[PDB]
Amino acid sequence: VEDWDLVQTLGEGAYGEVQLAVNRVTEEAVAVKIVDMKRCPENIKKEICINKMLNHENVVKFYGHRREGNIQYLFLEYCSGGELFDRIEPDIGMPEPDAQRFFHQLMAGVVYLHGIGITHRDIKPENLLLDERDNLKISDFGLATVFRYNNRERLLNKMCGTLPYVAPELLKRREFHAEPVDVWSCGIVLTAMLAGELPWDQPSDSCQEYSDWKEKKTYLNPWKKIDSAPLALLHKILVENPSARITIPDIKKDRWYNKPLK
Ligand SMILES: COc1cc(-c2ccc3c(-c4nc5ccccc5[nH]4)n[nH]c3c2)ccc1O
């Protein structure tokens, strides 16, 4: 019951590759991430550490790890649904009720992380997975880190993530709060699900489409495909001042978030 077969590649990233593994006797399917420390022994130990803490229905499950010399194995829940990236149709997105359900489950997963004192740092559709029942789970904690410990919040100074998803403070400030950055990225993921495109390459004032958003020109692409209710929330998430920006408990009170659709 503990010997597996590497059936197929699933995601060939930088650190290595996620492979599908089927057990020979039970037929049990698991996802194994293969990280070679020779071809980083630091940011791999943090991923394992963080994973062992995590237990939640919107987070991809961690089963254990084997060491086999330098080949590190990450035994993780497999999601047969794939990446949410592949459910976004380019230039159109997806039906609004689907977007709302995936956004609820994303919020739930993120409240949980923010609750355990951890921040993901790289929320995007490629890091969001659907299982068999089409429920969304947050995957890839390779950039994740602790921002509260012993009930003391620590500010971040490392720049990381993916540029079209990254919050503007992360470019501007030397130090910043973790949670607002996560919130911002979820709001980009929403734009993605509802329009089928990203609003900008980065939120820098040297980016036209971002300047157009601060100027409230919601008469252009991205925003004119959205719809006034979900757009009203995006107005509260994609705020340049991290302190003014809506928090999660307040996203849960939002008109579109509580509108029946699905
Ligand atoms: C929860 O922590 C992690 C999860 C993953 C991870 C990445 C990908 C998958 C997959 C997966 N299922 C797929 C189906 C189709 C295409 C690609 C897929 N990747 N299932 N489970 C995963 C788990 C990787 C690193 C982590 O630190």
Side-chain angles (χ1 to χ4, degrees), residues 1-37 40-42 44-262:
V1 208
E2 292 290 328
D3 227 4
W4 295 86
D5 316 287
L6 267 64
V7 167
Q8 57 181 302
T9 168
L10 253 48
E12 257 157 58
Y15 17 76
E17 24 138 75
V18 193
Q19 280 261 347
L20 219 178
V22 178
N23 196 292
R24 41 190 278 238
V25 217
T26 31
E27 193 74 33
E28 218 234 322
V30 298
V32 203
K33 219 251 259 161
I34 292 106
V35 200
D36 199 32
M37 277 149 135
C40 188
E42 171 269 329
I44 203 43
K45 237 96 189 103
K46 196 194 261 256
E47 186 168 30
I48 288 152
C49 207
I50 286 161
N51 259 296
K52 285 194 182 293
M53 293 160 81
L54 322 169
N55 189 45
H56 190 268
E57 68 267 28
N58 299 118
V59 184
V60 175
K61 230 129 219 147
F62 175 71
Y63 298 134
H65 63 113
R66 264 132 71 178
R67 349 284 216 103
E68 238 115 305
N70 254 61
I71 322 286
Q72 269 274 24
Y73 305 97
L74 273 279
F75 287 87
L76 296 144
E77 180 186 6
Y78 164 75
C79 304
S80 64
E83 306 192 338
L84 174 78
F85 191 87
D86 297 318
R87 303 247 201 243
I88 297 150
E89 287 79 55
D91 261 328
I92 61 223
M94 78 175 64
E96 204 186 296
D98 299 336
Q100 208 201 218
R101 196 180 68 112
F102 291 138
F103 189 80
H104 287 135
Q105 307 187 307
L106 176 58
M107 284 327 99
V110 163
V111 158
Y112 170 79
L113 294 190
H114 290 169
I116 222 277
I118 308 302
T119 172
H120 187 284
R121 299 203 280 175
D122 205 31
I123 294 169
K124 34 159 207 229
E126 308 92 305
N127 283 349
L128 303 166
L129 303 169
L130 308 325
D131 65 5
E132 63 289 334
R133 264 191 59 241
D134 233 41
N135 292 153
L136 180 136
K137 332 263 213 181
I138 300 162
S139 92
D140 194 354
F141 291 87
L143 298 197
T145 188
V146 186
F147 79 98
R148 201 183 315 103
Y149 198 77
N150 278 156
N151 230 75
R152 203 41 117 216
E153 194 199 355
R154 48 202 54 191
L155 299 169
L156 313 162
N157 41 258
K158 244 175 175 180
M159 275 189 262
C160 54
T162 296
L163 243 8
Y165 297 90
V166 122
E169 64 256 37
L170 160 322
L171 302 161
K172 285 172 184 91
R173 267 86 152 330
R174 190 178 55 118
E175 275 177 292
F176 46 84
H177 293 270
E179 293 168 280
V181 172
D182 275 357
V183 157
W184 174 284
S185 51
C186 299
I188 304 295
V189 167
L190 228 218
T191 306
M193 296 195 281
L194 286 177
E197 59 172 321
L198 278 347
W200 42 70
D201 315 318
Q202 48 196 92
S204 333
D205 291 339
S206 76
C207 199
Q208 188 47 231
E209 303 91 351
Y210 178 70
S211 318
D212 282 349
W213 161 258
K214 296 202 273 181
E215 281 169 73
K216 296 104 109 68
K217 305 188 167 181
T218 53
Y219 70 80
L220 300 147
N221 262 353
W223 327 104
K224 67 196 185 175
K225 302 196 269 196
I226 302 216
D227 182 78
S228 82
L231 227 199
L233 173 59
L234 251 13
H235 267 125
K236 307 182 273 161
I237 294 165
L238 303 168
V239 176
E240 191 167 45
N241 191 353
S243 309
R245 183 179 308 149
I246 198 140
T247 55
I248 299 156
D250 280 347
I251 294 173
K252 299 187 194 167
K253 285 146 190 67
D254 169 84
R255 174 171 124 260
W256 179 81
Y257 194 88
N258 292 293
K259 209 187 195 205
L261 303 158
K262 181 97 233 284

